[PDB]
Amino acid sequence: VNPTVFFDIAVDGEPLGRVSFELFADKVPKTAENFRALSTGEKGFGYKGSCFHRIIPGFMCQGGDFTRHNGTGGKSIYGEKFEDENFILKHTGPGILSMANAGPNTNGSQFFICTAKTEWLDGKHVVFGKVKEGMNIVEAMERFGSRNGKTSKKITIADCGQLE
Numbered sequence: 001v002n003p004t005v006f007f008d009i010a011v012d013g014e015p016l017g018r019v020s021f022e023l024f025a026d027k028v029p030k031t032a033e034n035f036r037a038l039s040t041g042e043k044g045f046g047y048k049g050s051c052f053h054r055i056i057p058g059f060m061c062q063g064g065d066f067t068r069h070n071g072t073g074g075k076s077i078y079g080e081k082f083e084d085e086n087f088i089l090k091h092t093g094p095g096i097l098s099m100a101n102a103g104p105n106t107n108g109s110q111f112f113i114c115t116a117k118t119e120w121l122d123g124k125h126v127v128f129g130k131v132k133e134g135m136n137i138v139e140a141m142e143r144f145g146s147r148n149g150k151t152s153k154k155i156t157i158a159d160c161g162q163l164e
Contacts, residue, residue: 001025001026002022002023002024002025002026002032003022003023003025003032003036003162003164004020004021004022004023004132004163004164005020005021005023005035005036005039005040005160005162005163006019006021006039006160006161006162006163007020007021007039007047007157007159007160008157008159008160009137009141009156009157009158010155010156010157010158011144011153011154011155012153012154013154013156015158016140016141016155017134017136017137017140018133018134018137019113019131019134019137020133020134020163021097021129021130021131021132022129022130022132023035023097023128023129024089024127024128024129024130027086027089027128028085028086028088028089028126028127028128029085030078030082030085031085031099031107031126032128032129033077034076034077034078034082034107034109035097035111035128035129036162037077038064038066038076038077038109039160039161039162040160040161040162041160041161043077045066045075046160047109047157047160048157048158048159048160049066049156049157049158050063050064050066050069050156050157051063051065051069051154051155051156051157052141052151052155052156052157053065053070053071053149053151054071054145054150054151055142055144055145055146055149055151055155056145056146056148056149057115057142057143057145057146057147058115058116058142059114059115060112060113060114060115060116060118061112061113061115061141061142061145061155062100062110062111062112062149063110063111063112063155063157064100064108064109064110064111065109065110066109071110074108074109074110075108075109076107076108076109080108081105081107081108082105082108083105083107084101084104084105084107084126085126085128086126087122087123087124087126087127089126089127089128090119090122090127091114091117091118091119091121091125091127092117092119093114093116093117094114094115094116094117094131094135094138095113095114095130095131095135095138096114096118096127096129096130097111097112097113097114097127097128097129097130097131098111098112098114098121098125098126098127098128099111099128100112100125101124101125107126113131113138115138115139115142141155
C-alpha cells in the first residue's frame with residue numbers, strides 16, 4: 001500500500017538513470033503525500049525539471065527547490081511550510097529520504113537522500129522514505145558533488161511520477 005515514486009535523473013541533459021522511492025505513507029501520511037503529489041505534479045506544480053542544488057559526497061544529495069533552484073525556495077502542497085509530523089523513523093544509513101527544513105515545523109519541498117548514516121539528524125528532520133531501486137544511480141550522482149556542495153554538472157529530475 002506504500003506508494004512508490006520515481007525520478008529519472010539527467011546530467012547536463014544526458015540521461016543517467018532512474019531511482020525509485022517507497023514513501024512510508026503508513027507512518028508519515030502527511031509528509032509522504034506531499035512528496036508523492038510533488039512527484040506526479042497533480043496539483044499543478046512539483047519536482048519535474050528541478051535540480052539537485054547541493055551534493056556532498058559521503059553525506060547526502062539535496063534537491064526539491066523548484067522555485068529558486070538554489071536552496072532558498074520551494075513550497076509544499078499544504079502551503080509555504082508545514083509541521084514536523086513525527087520522528088518515528090531514524091536516519092539509519094544510505095538511501096534514507098528525509099525532509100530539509102529551516103528550524104522546527106518549517107517543511108516545504110526540499111529533501112535530501114542520505115549517502116551515509118546521519119544519526120545526528122534524528123529528531124530534527126522527518127524521515128519519510130527510502131530508495132527502493134537505483135541506489136547505484138544515487139552513488140553516481142554523488143561523484144558530481146564536492147566538499148562544499150556545489151556540483152560540477154547540472155543534475156536534474158528530467159521526469160518523475162508514481163509507479164505504484
